[PDB]
């Protein structure tokens, strides 16, 4: 499942880099590198322009431990519950994932960041694989925003 592997590598690297402040590639490295750079520009913009909403959403989720981190899967599924899929929703979910990741670092729950990245990746790849393939994967992601 290369689409899962590539997606996890991009999403995990972004969440962990956002949480730790320290920038840390396999197959399709050139595309994945542009996707991660696109994610830095667009995702940092999303978190800044919607910071107040994200703060309230984070407080509502009330994440105090690793057990509270097993509820986000149902939240991520809710993003696409109306049947609509687009890159804006996808990048917004990953940006909010990075926002949670920063929170998890602050409360010394850094070990939860990887299961969070695996859960975001699973929802995208498991429930939207057809759409992601039709949109040409992360090449299409990079092209859609064309920063």
């Amino acid at each position: 499942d290369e689409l899962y592997r590539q997606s996890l590598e991009i999403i995990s690297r972004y969440l962990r880099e956002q949480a730790t402040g320290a920038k840390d590639m396999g197959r399709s490295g050139a595309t994945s590198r542009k996707a991660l750079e696109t994610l830095r520009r667009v995702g940092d913009g999303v978190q800044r322009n919607h910071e107040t909403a994200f703060q309230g959403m984070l407080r509502k989720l009330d994440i105090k431990n690793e057990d509270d981190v097993k509820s986000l899967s149902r939240v991520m599924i809710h993003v696409f519950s109306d049947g609509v899929t687009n890159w804006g929703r996808i990048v917004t979910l990953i940006s909010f994932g990075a926002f949670v990741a920063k929170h998890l670092k602050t409360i010394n729950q850094e070990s939860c960041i990887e299961p969070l990245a695996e859960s975001i990746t699973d929802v995208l790849v498991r429930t939207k694989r057809d759409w992601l393939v039709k949109q040409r994967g992360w090449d299409g992601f990079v092209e859609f925003f064309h920063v």
Partner: peptide, 20 residues
Amino acid sequence: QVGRQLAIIGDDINRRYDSE
């Protein structure tokens, strides 16, 4: 509530990049 609020924000982001 949270996933719906993310969907709304994401649609605004999508419109911003998609509009011709």
